[PDB]
Amino acid sequence: RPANHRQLTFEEIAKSAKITVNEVELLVMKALSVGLVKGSIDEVDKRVHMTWVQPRVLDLQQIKGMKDRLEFWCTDVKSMEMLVEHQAHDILT
Amino acid sequence: LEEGKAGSGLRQYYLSKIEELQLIVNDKSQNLRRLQAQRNELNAKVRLL
Amino acid sequence: AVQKVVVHPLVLLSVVDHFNRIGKVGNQKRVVGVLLGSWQKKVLDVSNSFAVPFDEDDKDDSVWFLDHDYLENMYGMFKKVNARERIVGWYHTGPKLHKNDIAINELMKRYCPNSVLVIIDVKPKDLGLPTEAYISVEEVHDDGTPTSKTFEHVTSEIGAEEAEEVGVEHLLRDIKDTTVGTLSQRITNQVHGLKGLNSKLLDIRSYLEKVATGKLPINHQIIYQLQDVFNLLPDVSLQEFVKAFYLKTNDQMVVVYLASLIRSVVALHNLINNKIANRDAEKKEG
Amino acid sequence: MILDKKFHGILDQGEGVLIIFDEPPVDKTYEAALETIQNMSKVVDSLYNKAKKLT
Amino acid sequence: FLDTVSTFTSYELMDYKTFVTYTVYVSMIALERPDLREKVIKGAEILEVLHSLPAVRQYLFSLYECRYSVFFQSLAVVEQEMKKDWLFAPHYRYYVREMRIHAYSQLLESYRSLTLGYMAEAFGVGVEFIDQELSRFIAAGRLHCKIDKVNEIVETNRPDSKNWQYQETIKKGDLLLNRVQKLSRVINM
Amino acid sequence: NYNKAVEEEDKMTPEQLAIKNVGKQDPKRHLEEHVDVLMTSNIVQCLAAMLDTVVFK
Amino acid sequence: DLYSRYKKLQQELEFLEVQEEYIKDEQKNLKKEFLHAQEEVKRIQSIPLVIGQ
Amino acid sequence: GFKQTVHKLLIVVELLLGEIPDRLQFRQPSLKRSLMPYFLLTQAVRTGNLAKFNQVLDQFGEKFQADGTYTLIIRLRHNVIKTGVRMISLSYSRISLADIAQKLQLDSPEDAEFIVAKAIRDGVIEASINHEKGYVQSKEMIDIYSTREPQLAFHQRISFCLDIHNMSVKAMRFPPKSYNKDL
Amino acid sequence: MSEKKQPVDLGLLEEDDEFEEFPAEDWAGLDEDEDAHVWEDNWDDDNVEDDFSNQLRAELEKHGYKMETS
């Protein structure tokens, strides 16, 4: 999930790793000890917030989604350029 | 009749109001060209510098 | 080793001379010039350069023609008249990096020290910076491919020290200086979207083309860092930055009070002289 | 000592909650307010010169 | 009254003890804690003249000490002495209210939330009177933000620094806006 | 600080302007410098839309 | 002459109206030249210099 | 001499909202004598005593009630309780059945919450209607927009103030043109 | 127009003809204690003054009796 409330909870980690709730702190502590993730969570109730990570293998749905979000960013920057520059060039030049 | 004095009369009065709009454009050209003479005289003054 | 380089416009105007002394023959190939500079300091500073007759073959790309006697004679006389600058590298005017450039650069890697490579465009239609410093160093690859010459992009800047700024400014008489204020800022704020639009739009099309229609590994490993950094800004909800909008908007309010108050101070002399001058000139005119 | 303003803090009786905060940008509202107060005399004096020359 | 060092017994207008007795009201009420600590508490003049009457020392150390249990018991002498004076009687209504709101702002300054028990025991008065007191001092007094009684506890917020410190100039911005509208009225006429 | 540092003299200007009104003796204009100060102050306004574009897309 | 003053005057309407964008060009360009020459005479003043009395 | 009508009607329509600003910054012996009969009632609005001030109005009321059709004063006679309950909105949250109901000269459970609800349906105040044990509570949050959506709060303030000050900039650009027009 | 002020000034002349110097002197009994005083503060002092004119004017002498009873 790149966007749309990336914030998560320990229920998915404990459910996918069939581990108890007492060992998830040592699990994320080892995850931060390896150095592949820099995630620091300011939570009060148990939550899992993550940061920069590298796939390093492959992702085709992220290639197609990369084209979708990339084309969306490009057409939004183009839309703002035509919008601001449209009347801005006519009134200021 | 009563057109050249009334119809063309109010048309001529509207032409006088058009002369008032050309008096606003006229004196705007006058003061804008006098300020243009001020900036031209100052930039020409530093050109003399 | 080298973090940044400095390229003076004199060598690029010498490329204008490369396009001037052609003679209308119909070749206009990638004429290679002998780049000169100061390799002593960590930063690279190009002062001037010269050229050498360079001709390739139509079909075979591996054909390249250089000269050692002309290089040692032009460099010997140039060192005799100015010994503060020595050989550093070369540069070609071709827009595309050919395979033969490893053999062309290899000669100045053997005889001369590590040469920097600069790719420019034959037509000044590219809005981006025409100069790209490509260092000729061999790098170890993680995939296991054999070690080969790699051209890493080194940042470059176009600056003049003492006189070329004056000569360019006198020859142009059209360009403007920094001139902080309305025009120099709003022009950048208008055309900047096209300055990024032509680059990104010009790159991601051939990029997306080489995604599906690509082979001969293009270093797909760096694409993971590409999309990674692109996904390092996952559409922040702006919840925490609201107070920052209150700070920047409060500074906006400060500019509002400064503009209204200061302009209200400027209205003094105008809204006084308009009366005291008109009524006195009118009452004293006749 | 909070009434003496020796440090940042505030007491409480019902809940006993302690809160510590500060306001660094003090030099903005002072200079702005002084510019407003000083410009009031400018506009008022302008209305005195124009009110004198007109009526 | 800062030049009280050079003052002396002047039988022409007012005695020295009457001058101190008259300036102790404007100094005791018209000044805050830093102004008193800087002017009078640091000065030795009130330290010399406090030995004449022991009441003034009680009205200074009790007010500066924030002890309302004795200040309200002894405030009746300030009430009766405040009136029946030549020049000081017609202003007796302003000193009372101004001193009460000044003390309420003094105690309420360093206190964010306040229960009715510690307040009633501190002031030594019933809650039925402070109810209408603060009720009248929210709109009439205009000292702090709105007060709530959902838990029967005096709880204020006072966001008067961060945003209101910048919003103190909007009044001069609106009055200056009407003044430059008058400047627009001067145009052509 | 420069704006107020000139306004402290602009408080004294309406006295001379309220006394003589004839001739100019001070070579300082007190106007174009403040115009330039406003031009330097408009960078916040011109770049606020830039931050709006960077935050938007 | 009476009715000809309208259409004859329209030529003066166009001749005076055409000066608007012209004085716009002059007032927008001559101040750019004013800051050009202003910065040109400003950059003449250099820091390295001799101090007299 | 003429502003006593726009000022008189001004304060007459201002006391309807519960907050009546009197004559503070203007010193002239015309609005004083004009306001002398109206001063007792315009001061009696805030305290809001129904039975006494109802007789006080018609007691000495000659000119302000002889002005015609007694429309806004016959609306004020029942607006006293609305400005008073608006002062209650400026007062504490909890509403008692004896203390504040007896204080407001209205001692009954139905019309208390009924008329207070008639003050809630206006929209000028903020309250939280909750019924747990029979008492009517209210949150009465009158906290200003400080650190509560400020950009949307004073956004229109910045736009409008820059529009008025900017047309004032036009009002300091055009008169110089009307100055240099003749020379 | 400035010509409509005449009947309003006539109404002011009628108000002045109702009582001849009666409100000037009777109100001057308080104005002699209000003269030269800032009238901005007289709105609050007159607000609480007229508010307490009916009952509990001083009330400070009664707190000493209200301490033990409340």
SSE topology sketch:
The structure is cut from a larger assembly and holds 9 protein chains of 9 kinds.
Chain C: E1 4-7, H1 9-18, E2 32-37, E3 44-46, E4 49-51, H2 69-81, E5 86-92, H3 101-110, E6 116-118, E7 133-138, E8 149-158, H4 164-172, H5 183-212, H6 221-230, H7 242-283
Parallel strand pairs in C: 1-3, 1-8
Antiparallel strand pairs in C: 2-4, 2-5, 6-7, 7-8
Chain D: H1 27-54
Chain E: H1 16-29, H2 33-41, H3 45-49, H4 54-65, H5 68-71, H6 75-82, H7 92-109, E1 113-115, H8 116-123, H9 127-141, E2 153-155, H10 164-167, H11 170-186
Antiparallel strand pairs in E: 1-2
PDB class: hydrolase
Keywords: p28, 26S proteasome, regulatory particle, 19S, gankyrin, hydrolase
Entry title: Conformational Landscape of the p28-Bound Human Proteasome Regulatory Particle
What's the helix-strand series of chain B?
H
Shape of chain F: rod-shaped
**What is the CA–CA distance across the termini of chain B?**
69 Å
Shape of chain B: rod-shaped
State the separation between the terminal residues of chain F, measured CA to CA: 37 Å
* Largest sheet composition of chain B: none
Instruction: Specify the number of helices of chain B.
Output: 1
Helix/strand-derived category of chain B reads mainly alpha
The multimeric state of the shown protein is part of a larger assembly
The amount of beta strand of chain B, in percent, is: under 5%
Give the C-alpha Rg of chain F. 18 Å
What is the element string of chain F, with H for helices and E for strands? Answer: HHH
Largest interface: D-E, 26 and 28 residues
Radius of gyration of chain B: 20 Å
The percent of residues in helical segments of chain F reads: 55-70%
- The class by helix and strand makeup of chain F works out as mainly alpha
Number of strands of chain B: 0
Number of strands of chain F: 0
Q: Output the number of helix runs of chain F.
A: 3
Helix content bin of chain B: over 70%
> DSSP strand (E) fraction of chain F?
under 5%
PDB class: hydrolase
Keywords: 26S proteasome, 19S, hydrolase
Entry title: Conformational Landscape of the p28-Bound Human Proteasome Regulatory Particle
Chain A: 26S proteasome non-ATPase regulatory subunit 13
